[PDB]
Amino acid sequence: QTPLYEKMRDYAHSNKVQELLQKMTADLFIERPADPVTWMIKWLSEEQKR
Amino acid sequence: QTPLYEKMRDYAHSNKVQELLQKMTADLFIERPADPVTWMIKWLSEEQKR
Amino acid sequence: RLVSSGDPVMREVETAFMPWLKEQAIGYLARGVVARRVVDKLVEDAAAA
Amino acid sequence: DYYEVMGLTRSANDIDIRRAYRRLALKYHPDINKDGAAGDEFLRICEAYEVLCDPKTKGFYDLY
């Protein structure tokens, strides 16, 4: 519970990153690519365009 | 029901995806960027080489 | 996992404070050396007297 | 989870668990339900009721 740990928890539990992670993992467990490294790249590229 | 969950549990609790996601999240928390999506694009780009 | 590997904020600041203690010790040792030299000069003058 | 597989909610009573297991394990038993996606379902039904029919294990699971 050092100020770093608390700061990390605040960032980890923030809205942006947590909803983005939830969305990405849901989509990834839908499509189920046998090479998630590249599918993540294309998915994030198309998301960033908006 | 069991079949829909099992198809996703078997995928997500397999090594490639899980220890990709854990390292990605760890580095994301360490870096603390303003906009996570382009940072994940970058990280996946220079991790695709490995 | 991230807290297992890595820091207690206290020891890191205490280690940062240590250089100052070392410098003060060096200064005190220099003072002692000066005192010893003064005593030697005093002994020489005592023999002359 | 051990709860959603039975269909119950986190605040289910004891009679609630009895009834849920009753219907779900008379719908998926191998001798009654001939075949389908009923292999894992029956096993998780049995495991969930076994975990949730004993207060010590039930509470230890509920906290963790």
Cβ-Cβ contacts under 8 Å, C1 against chain B: 22, 26
Q: How many domains does chain D fold into?
A: 1
Neighboring chains of D (3 or more beta-carbon pairs < 8 A): B
CB A28, CB A40: distance < 8 Å: yes
Residue the block writes with tokens 């854990």: B22
Residue the block writes with tokens 């294309």: A42
Exposed, middle or buried, D55 (CB in 10 Å: 0-12/13-18/19+)? Answer: exposed
DSSP assignments along B24-41, one per residue: HHHHHHHH--SSHHHHHH
Q: What is the resolution of this structure in A?
A: 3.2
Q: What is the DSSP letter of D7?
A: T
CB B2, CB D37: distance < 8 Å: yes
Neighboring chains of C (3 or more beta-carbon pairs < 8 A): A, B
Q: How many CB pairs under 8 A join B and D?
A: 12
| Full domain range(s) for residue D35 | 1-64
Q: How many CB pairs under 8 A join B and C?
A: 5
Closest residue in B to D44 (Cα) is B2
Cβ-Cβ contacts under 8 Å, B47 against chain A: 37
Closest residue in B to C3 (Cα) is B26
Contact B6 D40 (CB under 8 A): yes
Cβ-Cβ contacts under 8 Å, D39 against chain B: 2
Q: How far is CA D30 from CA B36, C39, D21, in A?
A: 49, 103, 15
Cβ-Cβ contacts under 8 Å, B29 against chain C: 2
D39 token code pair: 């292999």
- How far is D48 from chain B, CA to nearest CA, in Å? 13
Exposed, middle or buried, D48 (CB in 10 Å: 0-12/13-18/19+)? Answer: buried
- Residues near B37 by Cβ (< 8 Å), separated by ≥ 6? A20, A44, A47, A48
Q: Does B44 touch chain A (CB under 8 A)?
A: yes
Q: Does C2 touch chain B (CB under 8 A)?
A: yes
